[PDB]
Amino acid sequence: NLNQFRLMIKCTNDRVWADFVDYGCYCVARDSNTPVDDLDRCCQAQKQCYDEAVKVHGCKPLVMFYSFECRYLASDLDCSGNNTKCRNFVCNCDRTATLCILTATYNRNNHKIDPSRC
Amino acid sequence: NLNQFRLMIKCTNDRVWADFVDYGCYCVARDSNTPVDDLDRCCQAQKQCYDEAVKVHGCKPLVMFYSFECRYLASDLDCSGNNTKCRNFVCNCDRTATLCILTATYNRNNHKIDPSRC
Amino acid sequence: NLNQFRLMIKCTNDRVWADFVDYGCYCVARDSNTPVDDLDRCCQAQKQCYDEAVKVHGCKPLVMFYSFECRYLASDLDCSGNNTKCRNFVCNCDRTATLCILTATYNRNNHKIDPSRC
Amino acid sequence: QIRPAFCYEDPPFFQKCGAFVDSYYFNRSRITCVHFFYGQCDVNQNHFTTMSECNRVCHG
Amino acid sequence: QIRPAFCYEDPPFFQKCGAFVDSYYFNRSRITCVHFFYGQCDVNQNHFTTMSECNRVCHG
Amino acid sequence: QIRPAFCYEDPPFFQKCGAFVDSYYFNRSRITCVHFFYGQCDVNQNHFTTMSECNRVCHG
Amino acid sequence: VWALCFMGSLALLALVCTNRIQYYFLYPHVTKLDEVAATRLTFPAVTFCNLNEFRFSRVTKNDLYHAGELLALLNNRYEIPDTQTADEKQLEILQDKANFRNFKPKPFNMLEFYDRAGHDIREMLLSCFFRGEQCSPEDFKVVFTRYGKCYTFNAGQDGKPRLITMKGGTGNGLEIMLDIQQDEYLPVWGETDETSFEAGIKVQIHSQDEPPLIDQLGFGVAPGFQTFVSCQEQRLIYLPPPWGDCKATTGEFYDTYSITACRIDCETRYLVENCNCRMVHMPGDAPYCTPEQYKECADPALDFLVEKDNEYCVCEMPCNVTRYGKELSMVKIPSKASAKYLAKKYNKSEQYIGENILVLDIFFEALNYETIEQKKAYEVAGLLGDIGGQMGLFIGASILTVLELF
Amino acid sequence: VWALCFMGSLALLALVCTNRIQYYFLYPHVTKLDEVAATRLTFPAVTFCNLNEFRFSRVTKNDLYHAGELLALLNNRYEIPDTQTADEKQLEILQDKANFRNFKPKPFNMLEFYDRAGHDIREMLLSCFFRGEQCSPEDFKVVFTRYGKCYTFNAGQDGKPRLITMKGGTGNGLEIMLDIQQDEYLPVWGETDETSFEAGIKVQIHSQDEPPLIDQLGFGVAPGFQTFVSCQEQRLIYLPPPWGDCKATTGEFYDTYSITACRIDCETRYLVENCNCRMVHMPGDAPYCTPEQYKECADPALDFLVEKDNEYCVCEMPCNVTRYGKELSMVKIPSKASAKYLAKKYNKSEQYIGENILVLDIFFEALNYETIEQKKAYEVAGLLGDIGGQMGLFIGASILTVLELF
Amino acid sequence: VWALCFMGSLALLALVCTNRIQYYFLYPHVTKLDEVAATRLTFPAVTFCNLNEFRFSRVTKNDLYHAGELLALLNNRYEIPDTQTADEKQLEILQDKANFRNFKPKPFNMLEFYDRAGHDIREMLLSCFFRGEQCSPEDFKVVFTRYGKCYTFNAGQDGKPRLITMKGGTGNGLEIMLDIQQDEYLPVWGETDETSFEAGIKVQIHSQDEPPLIDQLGFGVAPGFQTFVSCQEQRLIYLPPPWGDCKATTGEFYDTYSITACRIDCETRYLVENCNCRMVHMPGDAPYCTPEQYKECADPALDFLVEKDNEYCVCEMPCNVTRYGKELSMVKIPSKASAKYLAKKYNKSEQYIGENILVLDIFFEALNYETIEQKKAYEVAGLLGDIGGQMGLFIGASILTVLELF
Ligand SMILES: [Cl-]
Ligand SMILES: [Cl-]
Ligand SMILES: [Cl-]
Ligand SMILES: [Cs+]
Ligand SMILES: [Cs+]
Ligand SMILES: [Cs+]
Ligand SMILES: [Cs+]
Ligand SMILES: [Cs+]
Ligand SMILES: [Cs+]
Ligand SMILES: [Cs+]
Ligand SMILES: [Cs+]
Ligand SMILES: [Cs+]
Ligand SMILES: [Cs+]
Ligand SMILES: [Cs+]
């Protein structure tokens, strides 16, 4: 779930959990159609990953637990330790989404916007 | 039984067990009708206690075992440690009888008398 | 078997195992009719013992195992430690045969002779 | 009250504050005095040098 | 690469090379710094005198 | 009687009366000499400095 | 030639006083073994759990509605799975209980469910004796564990005195007869953290200063036997810094530090941080996990921390540890000659008694406890005394000559 | 200025020689752990008891007349209680045996009854091996205990040599196969000190220098199993006064002091003092308790002393103690594939073998025994040597200067 | 008067320096106990054996021809004995298999027979978990023992890493569920070294540095139970000559010296020397024993050495020993409520599961291991330092005065 994502995020970068919380349209894990920029485009990929996690496999990405190992290199962040497909799958969604966060840049005014913006 | 009475007695007073053994008419635990003085009146209360122990409850006051705790004060002599009514009851007969001994006084010539005296 | 005989022999005397191996006609445990001297007469007694071990009891003197204790005196060599009649019996054949070896003398030219000699 | 109140106090069994020595104490279960090894722990007064002394002071 | 690579190294727990002292180390499972007793075994650099210093260098 | 009577005596296995040293003793079960560590307990004479010496005196 | 050797004498003396001063500041320690003859011993706490968490006859439709899937009685579609392994009777009770047609769910709480459906000391405890005296369900304190609703004898809480042993042997300890109630066990139709292939109880003998960690540190006792558990107390004492690295007190959920207190702190921090809830047996303020959270988050997370994790919880050594060495042994209950007596006495069949009844005896073999203790190896007096001894060795000095030369 | 500091030097020296002299007279000790490699070990004694005290087929009408009430076969009215729990067959044997109509009681003796009705080593012992060699009922000495008629292997009495172990493992120890004879067990119709809810044997492994105290200090072994008991010898040595408080010898019933010898002395003194009789397993001269005295006085008094008393028996520590640490483990007898063989061999059914047969293996895991020993910590030489060392520290004195100045 | 006392002083000094020099050359040692807090522990190897050596369904007519007599299936006349104890079905399979009429024997090999007919880890192992992770028959290495074909978990051979434990308790260890396959057990029609009255497995927990000696040093685990084995690592360290008598390395069959390696060397030397063959579980080059040699020479000789011999094998102490103390305990499998689930899961009856299924849990109670270590008691520095201290005691000398007087 999102406690581990928040932790995967703290593992990779120092940007406090709040700043992603209600950022843009999708962050963190909310539905819309048009993402404001690329940071918000990560969350859509994340959200679209959770949607696939639920439909194909049977996961419950927002409730379920998974484990991950924090290594020195962000890309080294490990998910192989998970004993089930479902638990392995969601751990990757968050892994993918958290690395993608590291690429994109943080435009403050896109955080906590109006619903008329999305 | 009378090994414990003899011990309850040694717990409270120094008068050797012999002196009560065939004292008067009742001491220790013999039957009669008229007690010679009050020491011999204790043993009657004791004897009448054993008689009640046998008829009402089913005790065997002369054979059965009980436990008692010897404390610093004679009145503190404890019988609460006994796990059955019958064992508790007889422990009290001896307790009652042994404290009552402490009140009364020892008139030597009333010890080992003739059966024509009782 | 003959590993223990070879050991019983080494327990009693220093004459190397080879010298008895194909000595005379009977040594060690071969069949014939006329023994060349008394050393070869021991082996016949030994061989005749194994023959009795097989027919009467059911032993297998050449395969079976037994235990023996090596003491300071050759005659003290012990076989009482064996838990079965069959194992006890064969241990004695070798004991008898090995002491008898100590009496007789070793005539070298009677070792490794021709089959036309027996 | 026939014997002192320390008579009913447990000796310092097995406790060492120095040399262990032959001593005697009143046993309130046997109602007589018994031998024990006393190791100089003056926890209470239930320890005598003689069995008889213990049997006078504490026996009754 | 956000925190040094020694941040992911286990401290010398329970190892004594001298005086044990209050110290702090980065826990790579909690992803924060935690108290431990350090006994002067300079096995690695994952030991700080202050929790905050540890939380600056190693937290991210 | 082919070998001495001390040949049949057990060595002082594991007994220390001083320095332990390479030694050899006659094994009356193997009927040959075997290595052991001897610790200067002169309990008997079944201990030699050399395997061969042991194999001469005691082997037969 | 001497002043050229009185100071050479002294130079080597300084490299010795340096080696000794540097050693005092290692603050070394040595370990001392010791037997201790005891006139008496404090009897430990004894926690026990039935291996079965929920009494079948106390599971309502509502409980089955909320927690049925967690106990593998229901699939994800809220129905009894067709791969059920039930008899005729149990299945037709459960198939009716699982009829949620026109049913409206009332609120649910795991802690309330454990407390109500967990096994009852009042029906389990056929008899209890400790040192001659008869004990009762009142002597057992309820404690919640991973097994659910468990009971501790001699918990020494309530403000109650702690019991004492004075002699070696079975007479000076505890003896309990329990009925484990297999007719009340929940049917096993799947494998989850709350199901059991086994029948019996789990037991842990611990100091009252520490909580149970019974799923991890306990022992098993099987029905159909009387089991003897002969114990030895063993006391470990460690030093705090700078000598050692032991933890004197605490400042989290328990008022005395032990390895178990530390682990339960960790497990609770870990479940809140990762599930936003605590299991009903953990301390704190956080909301209790729902049956959904147990299955989805709480069970997998506690399993991970207990099985796979190597970094999250590393516990500092405590300064005081009491270990009980145990030697277990067994005889069979009932004999053929006592089966019908016990059946008659508790109104059960002979087959039942042989399946459900157990006796447990817990006792010390001797008052004698063992102590292994860390002692400081080089106090201040031992630093000065040897500086002193080798002053007289090298320079030939003294307390007198130093004073005089001053 | 020096004589004002040579004596100030000396004053502080006297407060050190005082601290050292006062310490020697504490007679302190320290404890030394040690492993000891052993070429051989003396095998312990092994006492065992059937949990059932009286063979049903050896109880006569006379025995049932005198001891029936004690064994709960009879009520106080000398009749079989209507709350009996018997089969058809046993009850009709007992109801006939309890027909005392026109019966005249012959004399009775508990010791004779135990000796005659107790289980017989000759029928119990199916097989015994020790170190390859076959053992027999002759190797077992009869000993009377609270269980009645029991047997000790390797008692090392009779003037018989004690057996020895030379290697670790099951081959160098004892293996006994026993039939516990449940068809011979006494029916249980009540609860007394002589009745048993359990089937099996009790076992105690002890030095030959000490008696068994098997009801208190033994372990259980259950029928239907082969039980492995791997042992370690452990030797404790204590100091006598003034250093320690251990008891060297004795001057009551046993010729070597041990905690058990002390306890059996106490129990006997206690039963005579309180019942005027001894139980058949205790030593001395006093009359044996009658079945009435057992029920009324002897059982309650021994139970009290063993369960509730804290003052009557407090035992001085002995100077030599041998403890055996034990690790027990089990496998099942019989397998399905060996049941019919064993049935045929002892002429029983397959169900019988599975209920009555047990195998016990008792062995050492290694010759290595452990010693924990109290050593004197400050001998005379250690008192003088340090007075000496700090003479040279303070006053700068010597053995030479003291002699010279004289 | 002084030179007559400076040398008298010195004479007694020489009888002290002699007593100290003579002591250094005893090379004494003392033993040090110590606890060691561990962040992690290497998990031991765990060898297990079925008590049954040969699967009934894998015994061919040829095997029965060569080895039937050794397994008591055949008498010396190559026929099924009339004193057979078989059911209807097994006997009619064996009576047909033993029809050697017009049969011609193919070659035979005991090692091949054990390898082919011994129990298969692939059918025995229902489930294996270690620290959360699922393990497989691939994690078990085949090892041949007196029981035949056995399996070691965590053998740490192959070049595989050794597993580690980090916490106390059942979660951080191994859990295996095994089916012992009693329907596959060989019928017992006699008593030989290869037959078993018992059902279950034998287990040994050992360091990877040493081979198993499981028939001698193992423990039993019975079917029908879950057995808990709580362990403590204990490390013994000894000194080599001249201080001690421990064996550093080896120069016979194993690449690390241990008591077991020594014993297996001995047993092999003994079987070759006395039978001219080795058993299939021993190392070396010598031919494997034939079934005839097993019965006639190999079994009696190994039994003798293991039971009766006191001289052939006496093993030098090794310098490093790892012992695991064990506390065993049990609960019952299956409960009534899980029997039908497990039956369905493995396609067996409920009666079968209760006869063949076992669970084994092996774990540490705490990372804390114990070390008992021999330490050198009087190094060179401790020889000089005390010669020094009592120089200043007697002659009043010093390092300075000796130098100066030179
Ligand atoms: Cl944990
Ligand atoms: Cl007692
Ligand atoms: Cl061996
Ligand atoms: Cs995976
Ligand atoms: Cs009461
Ligand atoms: Cs014999
Ligand atoms: Cs009393
Ligand atoms: Cs006094
Ligand atoms: Cs006197
Ligand atoms: Cs993590
Ligand atoms: Cs640092
Ligand atoms: Cs700061
Ligand atoms: Cs031999
Ligand atoms: Cs020699």
Ligand SMILES: [Cs+]
């Ligand atoms: Cs030579």
Ligand SMILES: [Cs+]
């Ligand atoms: Cs649900």
Ligand SMILES: [Cs+]
């Ligand atoms: Cs509550």
Ligand SMILES: [Cs+]
């Ligand atoms: Cs009731």
Ligand SMILES: [Cs+]
């Ligand atoms: Cs309560």
Ligand SMILES: [Cs+]
């Ligand atoms: Cs479970």
Ligand SMILES: [Cs+]
């Ligand atoms: Cs706290």
Ligand SMILES: [Cs+]
């Ligand atoms: Cs959280």
Ligand SMILES: [Cs+]
């Ligand atoms: Cs030191």
Ligand SMILES: [Cs+]
């Ligand atoms: Cs001097």
Ligand SMILES: [Cs+]
């Ligand atoms: Cs009677």
Ligand SMILES: [Cs+]
């Ligand atoms: Cs007699």
Ligand SMILES: [Cs+]
């Ligand atoms: Cs027989």
Ligand SMILES: [Cs+]
């Ligand atoms: Cs006998």
Ligand SMILES: [Cs+]
């Ligand atoms: Cs009883």
Ligand SMILES: [Cs+]
């Ligand atoms: Cs005596």
